[PDB]
Symmetry: C5
Subunit: 394 residues, 5 copies
């Protein structure tokens, strides 16, 4: 009875085109906020953030009021899209192909005329995703909301703090906060300033996954390249080991290239460490070629330089703690015996060149091991969030 009577009366002469103020010269205060249920997807490559959000819009509708004693039991009424005036608040920085992704629900109105409009939606929004420190990165994705076609003279947009009471944690992203800011900007279209309310979703990436799936595997696989320095030259597999490990590491940059936007704004930290590793492994192959030249050095070819004999076999080697008819028969056997002496003399020259190769391996083992260690630590610890990350995620 009363519900039926109220609805009929409330729509009488109601025009949803009309901004529901008793005084047209005054603006309409609209309180705006949102509830952040969950961060669904942070697309780095396309620079889009996906969130499950419940917008929260409240205002007073001067015409939607009644005395509850004349309609007992009817404390609230509901109105669907198009039958009541509502604010045209949109996400400016939407990435959604239909632009407005909100699911229109009922506006809930109480007898004093206070309206509650809480449309849910899956929102896609453009977010400059800074990849400089990936995987130890923190993002600040803006969500700018404002009335599209009412400026500050007609619609006084006001902010209320975001609700995260129902926030469900992501797994990849720790929510740091969703602070909000209400600004009043002018646009080149119009002479009226249009207020907006922007919420900044601050997110720390949780680093365990990429620590285990990219960083640590690259460390361990690249160190396998350093075993080339311990592998004997006579194995005939130094180059196969080195070049095979090097080209396998390309998978990691391919994986990174599948996550990262193709931008020139910064060079991601992960890329810097992967580039350093492949350069170090590539130089290990370069050094390996030198070691093989020494190992295989032709004994009749050019003699070992004095510098080589001292810088490698003396100094570096010490530091590393390495260190009638009888006459004819006589001349024939002399030849055979002297022939062996030359062979053995050439053997000793070869041995020194092979010893030089071993010493070069040993110095390069220590040098590439130490150089691998410092470049890795230095690159990873240059991230401001590294210490926080290691403490929180590991």
């Amino acid at each position: 009875e009363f519900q039926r009577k109220l609805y009929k009366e409330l729509v009488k002469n109601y025009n949803p085109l009309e901004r529901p103020v008793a005084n047209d010269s005054q603006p309409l205060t609209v309180y705006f906020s949102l509830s952040l249920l969950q961060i669904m997807d942070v697309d780095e490559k396309n620079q889009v953030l996906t969130t499950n959000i419940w917008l929260q819009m409240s205002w007073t509708d001067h015409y939607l009021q009644w005395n509850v004693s004349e309609y007992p039991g009817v404390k609230t009424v509901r109105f669907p899209d198009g039958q009541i005036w509502k604010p045209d608040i949109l996400l400016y920085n939407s990435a959604d192909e239909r632009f407005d992704a909100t699911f229109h629900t009922n506006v809930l109105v109480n007898s004093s005329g206070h309206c509650q409009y809480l449309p849910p939606g899956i929102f896609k929004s453009s977010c400059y995703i800074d990849v400089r420190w990936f995987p130890f990165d923190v993002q600040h994705c803006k969500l700018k909301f404002g009335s599209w076609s009412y400026g500050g003279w007609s619609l006084d947009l006001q902010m209320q703090e975001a609700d995260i009471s129902g926030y469900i944690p992501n797994g990849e992203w720790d929510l740091v906060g969703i602070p909000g800011k209400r600004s009043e900007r002018f646009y080149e279209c119009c002479k009226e300033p249009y207020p907006d309310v922007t919420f900044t979703v601050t997110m720390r990436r949780r680093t365990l996954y990429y620590g285990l799936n990219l960083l640590i595997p690259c460390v361990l696989i690249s160190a396998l390249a350093l075993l080339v320095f311990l592998l004997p030259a006579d194995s005939g597999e130094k180059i196969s080991l080195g070049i095979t490990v090097l080209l396998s590491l390309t998978v990691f940059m391919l994986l990174v290239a599948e996550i990262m936007p193709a931008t020139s704004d910064s060079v991601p930290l992960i890329a810097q460490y992967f580039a350093s590793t492949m350069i170090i492994v590539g130089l290990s192959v370069v050094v390996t070629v030198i070691v093989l030249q020494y190992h295989h050095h032709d004994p009749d070819g050019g003699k070992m330089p004095k510098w080589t004999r001292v810088i490698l076999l003396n100094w570096c080697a010490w530091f590393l703690r390495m260190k009638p008819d009888l006459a004819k028969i006589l001349e024939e056997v002399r030849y055979i015996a002297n022939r062996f002496r030359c062979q053995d003399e050439s053997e000793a020259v070869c041995s020194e060149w092979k010893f030089a190769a071993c010493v070069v391996d040993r110095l390069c083992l220590m040098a590439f091991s130490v150089f691998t260690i410092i470049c890795t630590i230095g690159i990873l610890m240059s991230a401001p969030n590294f210490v926080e990350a290691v403490s929180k995620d590991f």
Copy 2:
């Protein structure tokens, strides 16, 4: 005649905005349930569950009633979307881009005014998919349903057990059950509690596919790395075999990385076993390098330590059950003969170093075989659902 007359009468003064209760002060009981036809897709990476569901909503509409003796043969009437009041029940944790994925169908109303609304739909819902025990994992995906804009004072949502009579099994997922729970929660928007009905779809993954396509192939491919310990050093292919098998195993983690969400909440069991295998294969390469140093040990280089001569050639080897002018001609032939004696003396030193290499291979074969076996069993059997899985799926 009568159908035409009834429809005309039933819409007379009917307002679909009105909650159809004879007494406005009382809430409207709405019975909610669903029928689960099939689980279409469990997207682990995006944490979304896709289901084919028929929602089941029933309530009484006080105004949609008639006396069947005055409209003979008209036992039921149907009303499409927008012409009758219906509950605004939505899936809260929807992942769908249009949020509400239900296909609006007719509400079926009988002469007593009992309404049946059974909209089908393909529903996408956010589901925390726990990957800790993958592939031996069990998921519990919630489907939370509630009236969006009517709270408990106006709409008394009540639960009925889910219907699985038409459930078509998936192939990848065994349905354990779809129990339901009706809660009464308060929200930071409002002072009215909003009832909800949540159904939890419990699903056991069937493990045969990933058992055959990931786990078993990795076991068999990694064991091929253990053949390096049986391969003779003189083959000159120990490193090629080991490093080639190791880098091939990366395909499996790449496959896993194509299924798993990039989260830091847990480390999947499959990842733990794959990580253990590659570490074991990687260490086999490391050991292989040592075996080659022994095999190729320079005989003039450092003598074999007493520890090496005993720990390998004595103890471990036993356990493994291995074990004028004539004077000038004389001095020339003496040199040639003594030269051979030194060569043979150096040969025996080489042989001992090569024997040491063989013993190290043999110990490492037994050690890496046993270590491969226990790590594999221990990791796989740490899954609570392993014994159930093996019994049910294999």
Copy 3:
């Protein structure tokens, strides 16, 4: 004149909510069928069939009738969606995200009131796609159609044979038939049985493509592994050939894993043959390691067992059709000459071990060739549709 007059008269008091029967107590016969234009996509991984279909619905509308002599030249009238009653027939097992994929077109009505409604659409439907015999598989995808909200008491759904006169063949799938079946089932929602009409699209896969792109390439690539048995051990490339071929075959299972659903219902035949091939190639590597141990056997190491000397060098080898100062100088030259005799004695031992390696290669060549042949034939011919496929597709 007459068209304008008829349309006006026909809509007078017409209520599209009304089921158009002259007698409300009787059900309305609705003839249902479809025309199958083409099979667009059979998605095995997602278990969805995509078809281009023209539904065919016919019924009589008691109110949409006129005497053609009073409206000369107006033999038919058309009505778009929402202005005439039509059956609410839906595809139950739809996979489409909007569930109902039909494109609403006009209902064509003639002066006797017979209605023709032939909406086209691209339909997505859930189909249990049995992969047990892939690529020699035959599918039976059901398309279940029924009135969503009218049961058998109100709507007498009747079947007519599917039209394939306009069927355009697919290229991958031979259409076997689209038989139809009309059932009368009860549901747990309701006490009225709801009739349905299900058409079963039977499809034979054409096997040439996967025969040429998966099966035959795997046969030919795997046979290249058998050349290891003909490759001499001294080449030092036996392991590189075997392991390289083995790991290349993984591409094929990766390709298969990109087509197959991740289900545990069956193990596809293609997977069984690929698994057999890799196991055979993997065992060839295992045998290759043994052959290298024989080839490289240390002559001073353990003597050849009597079993080895007979089972390989005698029986299997036959079957394969293989088969003062002068005294000092004397003792010095004696040593040199006796030294050569021991070297030659050890050479003969080595030769026997190398001959044993060659015989093992030869037996394994014949054994792995024969074993490859039978496993391949046996697996492929275990498919019931193999003989049909080879005759029809090759």
Copy 4:
């Protein structure tokens, strides 16, 4: 004034359900054509063509006419969707998920009642894409248009030649023409023939891209396999070169398999040439194994057949232009000297076997080079459009 007056008058008693003919017994002539702006995507795998098209529909509306002297300045009026009758022309062979992809725009009507309806749209259409001659292929994609629910008795569909004045060339596809054909077919639904207008978009693929990205790279990479015949056996890298090149060529068929539909209707020319190349490279590996058996032939093993000594070392080799105490000391030195003579005798046998290996390499180099050349030319020149393609694209 006049625009406002005309619109009011024109809608008075207008029924958009009515086919706008002054005489209902006559059919309505509808002129149909289209403008082809651009070919957006030719999806070979899914057999769908995507085009940007402006449909062109014209007809006369008997009711939408006025005298321009009574409405001065109003020479035309526009009507949006649903307010005027228009033809229900659809694309029969649509691949679009919503089936009808046209963007409804205004119908432009002039004072004589001539209507112009030119809706744009992005159209997806099913096209049998014949892959037999890919990349030198020419396609003929049909676009069949017709009134869905008006047959020839009511709607006289007439064709006008397609407009390509605004055609923007594709880059991958040369447009040959878009001829049109008007047919009159009967359907199994109805007794009225339904006219249709089909346009056939003929397209020649431009071959430069696939010439440079698939064909030529495969030629050059496969020829690298032929260097195995020039590589000395003693390098110990013949098998690594051959098998490594062979397995790298699989990338190309993988790329092709990512473009081609999985159909059994034909075998693409590109596939035939790739299959020929891998078979030739695979046989080169097979021959390489034989060459290594000769190179490594055991000298004590079976003697070289007379056929081998003549067919290789004589004929083929010529064609290729290759070609007391002193007695004891005596017997001891005799042994040492005779021992060397046997070694040298065995050396000469080895040399002949190694020479045989070199000759086999040389014949196979010339044979595989010539065989590679003819198979490549013969396969590529079997395409009817090859000569056209090479002239136009290269």
Copy 5:
């Protein structure tokens, strides 16, 4: 009061079909522009540009005017889609599947009747993306806007300069400008010219990303192939190094093939440099085979040509700065000693052939290094935007 009164009066007799001019014979001036917020995605493969744009349409509506002194405080009114006439301006070269991607918002009208319509949208547009100079490319994507169904006689479309005040930079693309051009073209449909306003979005690609991820990695990986010339032949890994590096470089063209459209209009610069690199690396393998023939040259085989002895061992080598019973015993030892002399004579021949191999390596090292350098510089510097790019991006 006044807002309610104004809205009622303004809609009285208003017909949104009517073009709002006081004089129908005159055209309606519509000012068109846009605001470019951000370039979202430049899809090279599909030739589609995605932009976030706010269209700006302004015109005067003769009927939507009032005297503000009679409606105090009501300075503006808003009207949603379908209740007011607006221009039907569309993007002609749209790539969007629904063609018109604009999100319809309110038209803002002030008391003088000036209308502001600023619909936002995510626009997809076809853009010929010229890949000739990629990654150093500059694109000019047209955005053609015009009234679909009003020609110049009725609608006088006028341009205003694009607004980039809110432009957010992309990261991959530097915005050069968005100049606009208003044209007046005739179409084959009609006799009225249809004005249009086209904006050309000029974009320079920022090259750092592809410089670091494609160009530089290819340079550094390919140079590793040049180490084959420094690797000794006796290593037995020259071919493994060369062919392994060569086939790894295929990844880069695969990456490029994943970005580039499959067009034959041009050959991208990146492809030209990648093709040059692989040809150079491939020729290095070809040369490596020659070096191995020299290294392994049979000493008894054909003597070294005079040309070889001079062009390599003399000229090129200099430039590179390389450089009773006793009689029987006598004849036996003579044989042994003469046997060694022949061995040593053959050794010297071998050494010269090995020296020739070393010289060929050295010339080829210098030749391939220099040839790699010039081809790389020459190809990269042939891009007109190279110098700009290096200065701006590096």
